[PDB]
Structure 1
Amino acid sequence: XXXXXXXXXXXXXXXXXXXXXXXXXXXXXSYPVSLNINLNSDKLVFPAVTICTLNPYRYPEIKEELEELDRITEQTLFDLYKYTLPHPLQAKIGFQLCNQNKSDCFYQTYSSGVDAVAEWYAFHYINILSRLPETLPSLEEDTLGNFIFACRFNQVSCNQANYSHFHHPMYGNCYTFNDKNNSNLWMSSMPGINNGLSLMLRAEQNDFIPLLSTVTGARVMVHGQDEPAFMDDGGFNLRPGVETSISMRKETLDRLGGDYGDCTKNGSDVPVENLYPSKYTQQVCIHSCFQESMIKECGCAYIFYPRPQNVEYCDYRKHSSWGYCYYKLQVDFSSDHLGCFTKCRKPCSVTSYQLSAGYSRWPSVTSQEWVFQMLSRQNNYTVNNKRNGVAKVNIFFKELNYKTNSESPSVTXXXXXXXXXXXXXXXXXXXXXXXXXXX
């Protein structure tokens, strides 16, 4: 009784020695994150503006082969609609798409004849355009004296503008003005319309092909500087005849690397090969593994994305099962079966551009008497009483700052375990003095 109340009394002042050493060990049982909002006042270095058309410019090489498509199109619409190729369409109208030595065929059916013909022509013209010789063009056709009337950024001209050029196979001609990283790059001193970019575009009403080019507008799209002109992301389709005031709100993102979250500072440790000549982004992994999956499955390269030098583009005369090879992989890619969303990580440098609009008709009743007389004497442009073809574009910054979503690590309370370490160090030592106090 006396010894039992003495030997058990030492377990009442020593039980807290491990009570703060086990509960604290179970508490932490991780990298913490934190967020800060900063408004960095920079010099507003002006981003690149990609200007594209909405008509695929036909080539003189393909001109003898493009008229054969219209011969089949006129024959089809006279029979089924009252108005050779290996894939005839026949009805609800549809489209037969088969594999080499396979009875099952995905019937590419459509509800209406408008989107049926516009996609039937988007299978032959997209495929036969891969037959072009990939060479430097021996006759430079400068449409900047025809398509863009005025390039006005910060009250000067664009005569000494080192511009890039690539023909998009679905939209047509394109122009990007700030792919270079030289000393003569553009920057916005003041957020003004008179201090911003002012453009005047010739949206061609009479299109080269009435089947694919079912629009008459003009595409204006902004992006980064080292980032590529992706143009399947989307931009401003603009009505011909109105002035568009495009205002931007730059919203960037700065996160931590692999020490805290799931992010990479640069595309170096990723397994996906950098197919673009640009910097790292999210599209450079998704749209390049999808290009290399076509190399693994078939012997074809896809046309909307760039091509490695060890393979050519695909053609139906070269590979008769290309349409089955693309349609089967596209419905398989959305189910995350290739795992390409999980292999490549997210970029730590994400710069997105918020895009608003403002619309106003560009000619007045006083301008139609005077501007079309002025414009016809300058660059040989005729007037059309139905619609106006020219369009004015104004790229504009809303304000000087831009919202930075910078992620920051935590302070240096994960050192509480070390605080409990010295606390437990003076716990068991003090407990021994309690039992020895009786003596």
Structure 2
Amino acid sequence: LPLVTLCDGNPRRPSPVLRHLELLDEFARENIDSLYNFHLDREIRLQRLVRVGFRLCNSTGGDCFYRGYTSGVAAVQDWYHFHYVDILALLPAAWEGHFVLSCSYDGLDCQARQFRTFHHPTYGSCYTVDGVWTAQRPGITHGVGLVLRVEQQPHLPLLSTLAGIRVMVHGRNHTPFLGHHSFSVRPGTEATISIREDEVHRCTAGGEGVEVELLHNTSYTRQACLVSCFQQLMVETCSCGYYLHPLPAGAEYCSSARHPAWGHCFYRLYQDLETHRLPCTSRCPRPCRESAFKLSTGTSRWPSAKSAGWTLATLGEQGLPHSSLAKINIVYQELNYRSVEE
């Protein structure tokens, strides 16, 4: 039976770097406010030119190129994201209530203590429902129901600009972020997500055969092979790793404090992915048996105007500041998954 991961879209400001992120917020205001009406490199700066963008150069200056966009909404987003990545690699040594207000299954209660929790820099805090139980029947009373807080005010205003929970449905023993079947839920609604699984058999046989070595514990899958291959190219060309990917045992995450031209390196390799120059796609096969999840979703307003007096008390019971909530019903659509072959 497949799992589901919920991510809040609101990453933290880790205490070890709290001052540096304030420096970046100040710098970002100084820039946007110019284009329109302390280790961080203040010269990797936004420019109005493509119509707006930012330049990247070689370690001695010399060669340079611009990433440029039709609109500032894209340029500011990506530029701030680059500087955010440039900070988080500095500190710490990878060190570290919930947004799940309530959970239930078939009348039973459940809590965050029963989920598995982790973070990812661009998706925020994440929880895995990790159900070891077997689906009894179709219908909502036989799948989980979850009530979730969407943190509309304290979003980091430049890093990500969506209001809603991200849903990722995936198999057992998978990291959720690669090959993400990312569905999303608006605040103030109840989303009824029904899951159907398709499988295909024919390639790398569950990890047996040819591979490029992986950098995290998982079932083998093509996307993970591409990610580790990209990280290998990054590390072997520029002796540091990119932050949104796992880190080889002998590497360091890139930052201007030690790798003063890493942006040029990264975005040229990423352009090789944009134009599909990289060798990884030829190195990495599909699994010899594989499955994909297909979601059919209905949505409705929640809570009703008359029963809204309840969610106010559910927030008060948790003492939370404060429609702001969302609800997700997750249904396993049919006991009818079967393989496609020949």
2:62 corresponds to 1:103: yes
Aligned counterpart, 1:172: 124
| Cα separation, partners in 2 of 1:403 and 1:232, compared to 1, 3 Å | closer
Aligned counterpart, 1:207: 154
Aligned counterpart, 1:324: 264
SS in 2 for 1:61: helix
Shift, 1:113, TM fit: 1.7
CA contact (8 A) 1:161 1:177 kept: no
Question: How many residue pairs end up in the alignment?
Answer: 337
CA contact (8 A) 1:51 1:221 kept: yes
Aligned counterpart, 1:253: 200
Aligned counterpart, 1:197: 144
Between the aligned partners of 2:219 and 2:312, the Cα distance in structure 1 is 46
Q: Counterpart of 2:31 in structure 1: which amino acid? A: T
2:177 corresponds to 1:230: yes
- Could you give the per-residue CA deviations for residues 94-149 of structure 1, whole angstroms, max 9, x where no partner exists? 21111123533111122222221111101101221112223554xxxxx43xx101
SS in 2 for 1:358: strand
CA contact (8 A) 1:207 1:216 kept: no
Between the aligned partners of 2:33 and 2:271, the Cα distance in structure 1 is 34
Aligned counterpart, 1:3: none
Aligned counterpart, 1:346: 286
Determine which of 34, 37, 45 is the counterpart of 1:88.
45
Shift, 1:336, TM fit: 4.5
Percent identity of equivalent pairs: 41
Determine which of 91, 115, 134 is the counterpart of 2:93.
134
**Which structure carries more strand by proportion?**
2
Determine which of 260, 264, 276 is the counterpart of 2:204.
264
Q: Counterpart of 1:65 in structure 2: which amino acid? A: H
Between the aligned partners of 1:293 and 1:252, the Cα distance in structure 2 is 32
Q: Say which is worse superposed, 149-158 or 243-252, in terms of deviation.
A: 149-158
CA contact (8 A) 2:193 2:295 kept: yes
SS in 2 for 1:251: strand
Aligned counterpart, 1:297: 237
CA contact (8 A) 1:254 1:350 kept: yes
Q: Counterpart of 1:401 in structure 2: which amino acid? A: N
| Cα separation, partners in 2 of 1:127 and 1:232, compared to 1, 3 Å | farther
Matches within 5 A, 1:132-171: 132-134=91-93, 137=96, 143-144=97-98, 147-159=99-111, 161-171=113-123
| Cα separation, partners in 2 of 1:274 and 1:73, compared to 1, 3 Å | closer
Shift, 1:190, TM fit: 1.2
2:3 corresponds to 1:48: yes
Between the aligned partners of 1:134 and 1:158, the Cα distance in structure 2 is 33
- Could you give the per-residue CA deviations for residues 43-64 of structure 1, whole angstroms, max 9, x where no partner exists? xx3x211110111211122210
Determine which of 297, 308, 319 is the counterpart of 1:380.
319
CA contact (8 A) 1:154 1:188 kept: no
- What TM-score, normalized to structure 1? 0.72
Shift, 1:273, TM fit: 0.6
Shift, 1:225, TM fit: 0.4
Shift, 1:72, TM fit: 1.2
Between the aligned partners of 2:115 and 2:222, the Cα distance in structure 1 is 25
Between the aligned partners of 1:93 and 1:334, the Cα distance in structure 2 is 20
Q: CA RMSD in A?
A: 2.0
2:31 corresponds to 1:73: no
Between the aligned partners of 2:112 and 2:58, the Cα distance in structure 1 is 52
- Could you give the per-residue CA deviations for residues 54-94 of structure 1, whole angstroms, max 9, x where no partner exists? 11211122210011112112222332212x61312222332
Between the aligned partners of 2:212 and 2:3, the Cα distance in structure 1 is 26
Higher relative contact order (CA 8 A, sep 6+): 1
SS in 2 for 1:98: strand
Between the aligned partners of 1:389 and 1:232, the Cα distance in structure 2 is 29
Aligned counterpart, 1:39: none
Aligned counterpart, 2:227: 287
Shift, 1:169, TM fit: 0.6
